[PDB]
Every structure is written in C-alpha cells, then in structure tokens.
RNA sequence: UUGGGCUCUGUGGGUGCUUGGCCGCUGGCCAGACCUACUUCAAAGCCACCGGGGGUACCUACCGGUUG
RNA sequence: GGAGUAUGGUCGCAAGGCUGAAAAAUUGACGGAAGGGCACCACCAGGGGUGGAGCCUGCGCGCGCGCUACACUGACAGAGCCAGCGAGUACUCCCUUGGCCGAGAGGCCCGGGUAAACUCUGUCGUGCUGAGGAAUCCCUAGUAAGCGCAAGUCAUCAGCUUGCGUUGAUUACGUCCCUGCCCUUUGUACACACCGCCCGUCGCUACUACCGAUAGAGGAAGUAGGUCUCCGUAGGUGAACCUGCGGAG
C-alpha cells in the first residue's frame, strides 16, 4: 500500500510547452505548437467578485452589471439566488391604562 | 472513475482474484477484464442495466485485446495459448496452442533444459 | 480469494488473543502512567520491572491516543467504517412462500442500498461463496413458520459478526390496503439506540448501525426525513420504521411505516453463517439457574 | 519514541512504521513500538522469506528440500516464475505463491488426490 | 543382413565471425643469445562502507592548551 | 503503622411553592418549473399465487398462511436406469382378547384395531370415476414451478421449520410515457469542450419617512548617463601618493 496521498502543490509557468519539453536541436512540434501558453485563459483572467469593480458586481455568467444599472426586480432574484445557495449551505397607571 | 469530474463512480466486483489486464472494446460498448481466477469477464456497463457476463477459461488470464472490428476479442492465458471470441454470442470461435511456438529459454541459474 | 479470506479472518483471530496479552499489560502500565502526572505512588511490581518501564518509553502514545480517541479500535468494522457505502442483501429461506415473500420485499424497502434475492435451489455454502465474490457488507436472512416470519439472520461479510434472532409482534407492511399505506421513501435514515449499556450492547449495535448508508455530515441534524429506532428492555429490542415531518422548532409529527419487530437476539457469533465450528461469543442462556435474573444489553 | 509522546509526526509515524511493516508480515501485532523496538528481527526476516514460507504454507517437507524444489523451479508467484530463494513474500502474496504450469510436482499431486486431468 | 542389447567410462570436434607459438617485441627466438648496466634532484591535495540503543577507567583519532 | 481498595451505618446539604393538568433567524419557513438518475411496491411482455370447496396453526365469527382433493398431463401390468445431506451405548405409534411360564412383582407367544422422477414394452379409453370472479399480491436465470430425501441444533418450529439433491422453461432484460421515489439549480479539481445570470409567497436585519395615543412603546409601508590616460591647479602627509577643480588626447 503506497501512502495516503498527501497534498503537493506544484507551480507551472506563463511560458510555453517548448520550455516544458527537454533539450534538443529543435522542437519536434509543428509551427502553431510553440504559442500555446502551458496554461489556460482561465488562469491568466476570469472575472469574479474578488475582482469586481466597485459599484458593480460580476454575474455567475461573469458579466459586469452595476447596482445602480440593476433592476429592483433582479435584486429581488438574486437576493433569493444567493441566499438559496447559502441555505443550501414599572411604568405608570397613566401610560399603562392611557 | 469519471474522467470530467473526477469523483469515484463504480467499483465493479465479480472477481475471485486480482483483475490482470483490461481494455475497452474500441466502439466503447464493453469493458473487459480478465482475472488469474481463470475467468474472463464482459462488462457492459453504459448499457442501463450495467451487466456482466463471464467468460470460464482453462487458467489465468494475461493479456487482452481488440479488433478495431468490435466483434471480437482475444485473450491470451497462462498455459499460453490464445483463445479468440465473438464478443456478441459469447462462444469462442478460435484457439492456438503456441507453447513450443515460443519456448526459448536457458537463462543463468535456470536449471531446467 | 478464497486462500486470502482464510488468510486474514484467522490473522484477525490470532491479533485478538494478541490484544488479550497486551491489554493484561496494559493494565500495569495505565496506573504507571497516571503516577507520573500524579505524583501519587505506585505500586512497587509496577515500580520495578524494567522491561515494562522501558516498553513504556516507546509504547506511551497509544495509551494516550486512545484517550483522546484519536484512533478507533481494531475491529472487523474500523477498516470500512464511514468510507463505502455498505450493500445489503435480503434472502428468503429455501422454498419461501408468499406472505413471507412480500415481507421481505417490505424490509428491503426499508434499508436503502439492498437487494433481495430469490433464493430457490441454492447451497447455502455457495450463497456465502456469492458473497465473498461480490464483497458484500451483510447478508440477511428470513425463516417463516407459517405466513409470520420468525428469525432473521444477519451477518456480517466479508467474514464479520452474525446475530441471529427471533421475531415477534411483527406486523407486516402487507395487512394494510394500498389506499392507505403507498411506497416509502428510499432516504438515508437516521438511526437512534435507546438503552444499550453493556460493552456487548455496544457489540449489538455496532452489528447493526454499520447496516446503513453514511450520512452526510454537514446539515444531518437538520435534514432527514426517516428515522429508525432501536429501544431495548428485557433483552427484546424493538424496532420501529418512522417517518416524520418538523412541523415546528417546537413541534413535530411522525408516521409509522415499516414492520414494527421485537427481535430477542440468541446467537452473536464471531463466525459467519456457514460455519458452525466457529467462536460463539454469547448466545442465549435459558435452562441455567438465573439465566432468567440476569440481562445482557 | 525519542520524540515527545503527543506529536502529530510522531502519531502519524507510529501508525506508518507499523501498518507497513505489518503488510510485510515481518511483525504480528499493529499497536506496540515496544514490539518494534525488541522484536524485528533478522530471524522474522528470514522466516518471511519464501522458502521458509513455503513450509508454513506446506508446499513441501523440509524447507531444505523446498529450496531444491525452487531452485529447480517449481515455485511460481503471481503469474512469473521465482528462481531467486530470497524472493521476500510480503503478506499479500502468501496467498499467490503456488505451483508452475508444467510441473511433475503438480501432476504428482493431483495423482496421489485422483483427479489427474491430462487436460 | 554372417551375433544382438542395456548401462557405464574415457578421448576429439562442436555447443558465439576462421589472422600464428614465445620474448626483455618496428626485432629476434623457437638448439636460443647478452645477462647488471644507467642515473639528476622523494613526494600536490581530498575521499575512501564494520548492524542499533548503551558505558567509558585505559588505548587511539581529533580539538584546545602547558613546560622543555 | 503507611498506602490503596471495597462494604455498611452515622451525620449535613441537596429538601421553603406569585401557585393550582391538558424559541433562534444577514443562516429561517414553504412552494413551483426545468433537467437527470432510478424501481416486477413504475411503464411493457408474460408468468404465478391467494381469493371457489374441505382441513387446520396463526392473527382480530371475520381473516388470510400452509395441507388435501378436484382427469387426459389417464389407469393397470411389466422392463430399465440415476442423487445429496445424516452415525451420542442411541432408536420404539398403539393399547388391547387369549394362553405360556411366572407363591407374588414380570417376561414371553399368538390375534384385533439404498428417492421420487424419468425412458421403454404391452393392455383398456372422458365414465360426481370438473384448476377456483371481481379484486388483490408476488416474480426476470440454475429464477417461476415440479419432484422427493434427510435433519430436528439453548430463540421460534411438528397442525411445521430448515436443509441437500433432482428436472428446469417461457417472457422483458429496454424506457422515464403513467405511478412514484430520489437528486440536481451550492460547494468537493484545472486541460481541451459546452453551459451561461431559474421562478413564487413570506420571515429575520439596517435605514428611511408616515400614523396615533402617554421624550414613548406600539401600528403601517418602502428601500438594502564623460570612462581611461596625460597635463595645469588647490588642499591633504610628505619624493611618490590621495582628493577636488580646470584643460588636452
């Protein structure tokens, strides 16, 4: 029995899958291999709360709405979106009788 | 094990030992496995019901294979002969018995002729 | 396989008498142990053998551990405890009849992760042997007498525990007319024990409440539409199959929907249900002189 | 036991040490670092050797004869045949270590409990 | 087919692609021959595996001192 | 004497009744629509009980559950050929007419109340000599069902339980349409790939203002860039040398 498997993290670049291969005279990949980035557009960017403008918020689709723009409506709904995921989750006489 | 989102799916079980070697059939109706309890074993699992039906051997199993025609499969035993099935009517068409059509031997220390 | 499953039930056999020799040690080295927090003294034996204080040395953090319960025991049920969810099957006597037939397509019903079988012509070696080849958490019997059902069965594999008990007062799921009873939720009961308070209570139920699904631990107290119960008293545990609505942080419905059982539990073996040969561990003492008087549970 | 009774590393090497040596037969018990420090031994290295542990399975007589037989190859494990007699059989494979496919032991066998298949 | 047979036990080639024997080797020798001369200057360093816990008065390794 | 362990008895507290049976909530309460996964308690192909008559354990006269009977799959005569489980010095259905030998208690003897199945050969032929409604309930592979044989296991079970073997089919083996049950609409892993803000009624919270009695609790709503060399200088510790300035290469 090998181990509980234990948690690594292991860092990879913003350079390309030719960094990743080893040494050699030239790259065995053809010419659109080589711009590829060894990561993916998610990791370079994806708009989210951690990122939103100020007085906007992103969407679960990930697009820019503002508070101000938003509809009392939509507010409404995702009021009720977000709290479904997080459910998911002695005196006187005269005072007294008067 | 789901590939697309990674958490445990089946666990399949039949098996009277060690499952030895596996293959899907190349459209992907069948999996198949062969396991050292003489037994090689059809399981189709993304059919609704997710069935099995086995397959009794004269030994051990080794190795397990395809035609690109998904019809048949070819599975190669431990007293060494091939056998060679229809995957479909589960009856084995074919045999070959290659024992001395592969013994070549005497290693060092192997005091055997 | 099946040299494998000898193999490890009689290594299971063999740590325990293990166990026995060790925990007869340490005995001594508890009250060595309390003495050095303590400062209180000690007996003098204790005091003075040295391999003991050595052994100490190496071996003190088990006995602290299991204070802490940072480990559960060894036991045929910690290997898998919460990890898998255990499959249960639910098999008849050799030629069944009906009635019993629709009773035990009632506690199927009742357990979620079950099959039944129809057993028919079966050797009942070989229905263990399906067992060990399909790596089953239990089988399940049923006897009948006549129309009523009398003993279950339960066993625990790949090599565990058996009960087997009698029934009575059972009433079926089938006297009650579809109109008014209907299909029953496949839910992932809670359970609860009420009055189990020897070590061999424990035993009983941890054979049984390793039947179930895990649960899910996040919002379980809070979820959950199904509930099972075992109450014991004079050693008849009786269990009930209830189904509830929370009306209120202050009020609450139930409505029952299983078999209502007594079962009085007479044979707790370490020893599956083939073999006869095998360690009872406590079976049902009528005949003696206070086999009467005392109670276990 | 150097390190301080109430360590996590110490816990979690504890249960390592004596889980694995425990799946390599070599101890008896899963709960003692006493039985770790005075009881590994070279001597239950040995008898968990294969030769040795063809005795306790009884394969043959006399572990000295069990070592002619491996040596001239009767011996398989797994699905490969074993020539080299300190093929340690860890615990999972007591249970495998068995008899070739074209052996006069194996026929020898099944002549004396009659069922001698010529196929 | 005008003896047959088992078993044992030797020798010889084979069981890996064919360039000679020997010696102080650019030559000689296989019958061998000559046999002891000649010299400017000791050295660069490192590493180099004995099963575990344990004691350490004496020996040793090291490290720091002390008189002569 | 000390240290523990028990055991019982003593003592003090607990042991003074504005009282007379029948909430939490920034997290909560309840839906709904869509989409998936499932199930002889769903659909579909069939099969098979019970429910008709008799017997009776059981349960509450009622009620099923088991057993029996009911005819073409017939009856009689032969012939042949197959199982598996079971071994405690242990096993019996009566109870009775007579008689024997028993002074008496008995023991005798005579009377009365290792399989079915299956195959083959041949003889006769529907002949009170009638297979169970509406309902309901169960079943998908050595399974439904048939057939016997044995055991009798500290609970239950001889008005039967439980085993073992024997022969062994049809029929779906798919689909969420009906019935339902569960689960998605949060999280729990990233590449390609795709998807793209579910919906309702209220609660709780902050704020806003309103209403009306006596600063005040209430009622009622909304909002959330000069290096190197050389030279001429001034100072330093002087030959030299350093520092700084100013000029040439």
Same mark, same amino acid.
């Given at each position: 029995?090998?181990?509980?498997?234990?948690?690594?993290?292991?860092?990879?670049?913003?350079?390309?899958?030719?960094?990743?291969?080893?040494?050699?005279?030239?790259?065995?990949?053809?010419?659109?291999?080589?711009?590829?980035?060894?990561?993916?557009?998610?990791?370079?960017?994806?708009?989210?709360?951690?990122?939103?403008?100020?007085?906007?918020?992103?969407?679960?689709?990930?697009?820019?709405?503002?508070?101000?723009?938003?509809?009392?409506?939509?507010?409404?709904?995702?009021?009720?979106?977000?709290?479904?995921?997080?459910?998911?989750?002695?005196?006187?006489?005269?005072?007294?009788?008067? | 094990?789901?590939?697309?989102?990674?958490?445990?799916?089946?666990?399949?079980?039949?098996?009277?030992?060690?499952?030895?070697?596996? =293959? &899907?059939? @190349? $459209?992907?109706?069948?999996?198949?496995?062969?396991?050292? #309890?003489?037994?090689?074993?059809? /399981? +189709?699992?993304?059919?609704?019901?997710?069935?099995?039906?086995?397959?009794?051997?004269?030994?051990?199993?080794?190795?397990? =294979? &395809?035609? @690109? $025609?998904?019809?048949?499969?070819?599975?190669?035993?431990? #007293?060494?002969?091939?056998?060679? /099935? +229809?995957?479909?009517?589960?009856?084995?068409?074919?045999?070959?018995?290659?024992?001395?059509?592969?013994?070549?031997?005497?290693?060092?220390?192997?005091?055997?002729? | 396989?099946?040299?494998?499953?000898?193999?490890?039930?009689?290594?299971?056999?063999?740590?325990?008498?293990?166990?026995?020799?060790?925990?007869?040690?340490?005995?001594?080295?508890?009250?060595?142990?309390?003495?050095?927090?303590?400062?209180?003294?000690?007996?003098?034996?204790?005091?003075?053998?040295?391999?003991?204080?050595?052994?100490?040395?190496?071996?003190?953090?088990?006995?602290?551990?299991?204070?802490?319960?940072?480990?559960?025991?060894?036991?045929?049920?910690?290997?898998?405890?919460?990890?898998?969810?255990?499959?249960?099957?639910?098999?008849?006597?050799?030629?069944?009849?009906?009635?019993?037939?629709?009773?035990?397509?009632?506690?199927?019903?009742?357990?979620?992760?079950?099959?039944?079988?129809?057993?028919?012509?079966?050797?009942?070696?070989?229905?263990?042997?399906?067992?060990?080849?399909?790596?089953?958490?239990?089988?399940?019997?049923?006897?009948?007498?006549?129309?009523?059902?009398?003993?279950?069965?339960?066993?625990?594999?790949?090599?565990?525990?058996?009960?087997?008990?009698?029934?009575?007062?059972?009433?079926?799921?089938?006297?009650?007319?579809?109109?008014?009873?209907?299909?029953?939720?496949?839910?992932?009961?809670?359970?609860?024990?009420?009055?189990?308070?020897?070590?061999?209570?424990?035993?009983?139920?941890?054979?049984?409440?390793?039947?179930?699904?895990?649960?899910?631990?996040?919002?379980?107290?809070?979820?959950?539409?199904?509930?099972?119960?075992?109450?014991?008293?004079?050693?008849?545990?009786?269990?009930?199959?209830?189904?509830?609505?929370?009306?209120?942080?202050?009020?609450?419905?139930?409505?029952?929907?299983?078999?209502?059982?007594?079962?009085?539990?007479?044979?707790?073996?370490?020893?599956?249900?083939?073999?006869?040969?095998?360690?009872?561990?406590?079976?049902?003492?009528?005949?003696?002189?206070?086999?009467?008087?005392?109670?276990?549970? | 036991?150097?390190?301080?009774?109430?360590?996590?590393?110490?816990?979690?090497?504890?249960?390592?040490?004596?889980?694995?040596?425990?799946?390599?037969?070599?101890?008896?018990?899963?709960?003692?670092?006493?039985?770790?420090?005075?009881?590994?031994?070279?001597?239950?290295?040995?008898?968990?050797?294969?030769?040795?542990?063809?005795?306790?399975?009884?394969?043959?007589?006399?572990?000295?004869?069990?070592?002619?037989?491996?040596?001239?190859?009767?011996?398989?494990?797994?699905?490969?045949?074993?020539?080299?007699?300190?093929?340690?059989?860890?615990?999972?494979?007591?249970?495998?270590?068995?008899?070739?496919?074209?052996?006069?032991?194996?026929?020898?066998?099944?002549?004396?409990?009659?069922?001698?298949?010529?196929?």
């Amino acid at each position: 029995k090998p181990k509980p498997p234990a948690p690594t993290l292991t860092v990879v670049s913003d350079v390309a899958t030719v960094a990743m291969e080893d040494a050699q005279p030239a790259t065995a990949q053809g010419v659109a291999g080589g711009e590829t980035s060894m990561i993916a557009p998610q990791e370079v960017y994806a708009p989210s709360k951690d990122t939103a403008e100020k007085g906007e918020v992103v969407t679960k689709a990930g697009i820019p709405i503002a508070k101000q723009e938003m509809s009392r409506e939509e507010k409404l709904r995702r009021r009720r979106r977000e709290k479904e995921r997080i459910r998911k989750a002695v005196q006187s006489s005269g005072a007294y009788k008067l | 094990w789901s590939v697309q989102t990674g958490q445990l799916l089946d666990r399949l079980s039949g098996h009277e030992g060690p499952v030895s070697s596996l =293959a &899907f059939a @190349p $459209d992907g109706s069948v999996l198949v496995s062969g396991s050292w #309890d003489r037994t090689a074993r059809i /399981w +189709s699992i993304f059919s609704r019901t997710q069935t099995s039906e086995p397959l009794q051997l004269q030994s051990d199993v080794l190795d397990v =294979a &395809f035609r @690109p $025609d998904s019809k048949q499969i070819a599975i190669s035993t431990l #007293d060494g002969q091939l056998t060679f /099935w +229809s995957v479909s009517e589960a009856q084995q068409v074919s045999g070959v018995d290659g024992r001395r059509d592969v013994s070549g031997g005497r290693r060092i220390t192997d005091r055997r002729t | 396989m099946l040299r494998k499953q000898a193999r490890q039930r009689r290594d299971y056999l063999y740590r325990r008498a293990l166990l026995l020799r060790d925990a007869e040690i340490a005995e001594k080295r508890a009250k060595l142990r309390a003495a050095l927090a303590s400062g209180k003294p000690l007996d003098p034996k204790i005091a003075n053998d040295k391999e003991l204080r050595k052994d100490f040395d190496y071996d003190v953090s088990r006995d602290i551990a299991k204070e802490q319960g940072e480990i559960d025991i060894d036991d045929e049920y910690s290997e898998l405890s919460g990890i898998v969810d255990p499959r249960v099957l639910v098999t008849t006597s050799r030629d069944p009849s009906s009635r019993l037939m629709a009773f035990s397509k009632e506690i199927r019903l009742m357990f979620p992760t079950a099959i039944r079988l129809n057993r028919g012509n079966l050797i009942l070696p070989d229905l263990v042997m399906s067992a060990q080849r399909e790596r089953l958490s239990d089988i399940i019997l049923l006897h009948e007498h006549r129309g009523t059902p009398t003993a279950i069965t339960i066993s625990h594999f790949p090599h565990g525990p058996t009960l087997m008990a009698s029934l009575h007062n059972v009433v079926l799921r089938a006297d009650i007319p579809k109109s008014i009873k209907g299909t029953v939720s496949e839910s992932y009961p809670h359970l609860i024990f009420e009055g189990f308070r020897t070590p061999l209570g424990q035993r009983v139920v941890k054979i049984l409440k390793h039947l179930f699904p895990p649960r899910d631990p996040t919002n379980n107290a809070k979820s959950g539409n199904r509930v099972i119960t075992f109450v014991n008293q004079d050693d008849c545990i009786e269990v009930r199959h209830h189904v509830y609505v929370r009306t209120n942080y202050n009020s609450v419905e139930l409505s029952e929907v299983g078999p209502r059982f007594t079962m009085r539990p007479f044979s707790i073996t370490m020893g599956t249900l083939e073999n006869k040969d095998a360690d009872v561990e406590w079976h049902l003492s009528q005949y003696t002189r206070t086999g009467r008087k005392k109670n276990y549970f | 036991s150097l390190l301080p009774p109430d360590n996590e590393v110490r816990r979690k090497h504890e249960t390592l040490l004596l889980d694995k040596l425990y799946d390599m037969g070599i101890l008896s018990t899963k709960a003692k670092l006493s039985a770790v420090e005075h009881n590994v031994t070279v001597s239950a290295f040995a008898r968990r050797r294969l030769p040795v542990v063809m005795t306790r399975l009884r394969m043959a007589e006399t572990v000295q004869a069990a070592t002619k037989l491996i040596e001239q190859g009767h011996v398989r494990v797994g699905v490969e045949e074993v020539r080299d007699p300190a093929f340690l059989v860890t615990r999972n494979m007591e249970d495998f270590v068995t008899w070739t496919v074209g052996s006069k032991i194996k026929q020898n066998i099944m002549k004396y409990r009659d069922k001698l298949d010529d196929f």
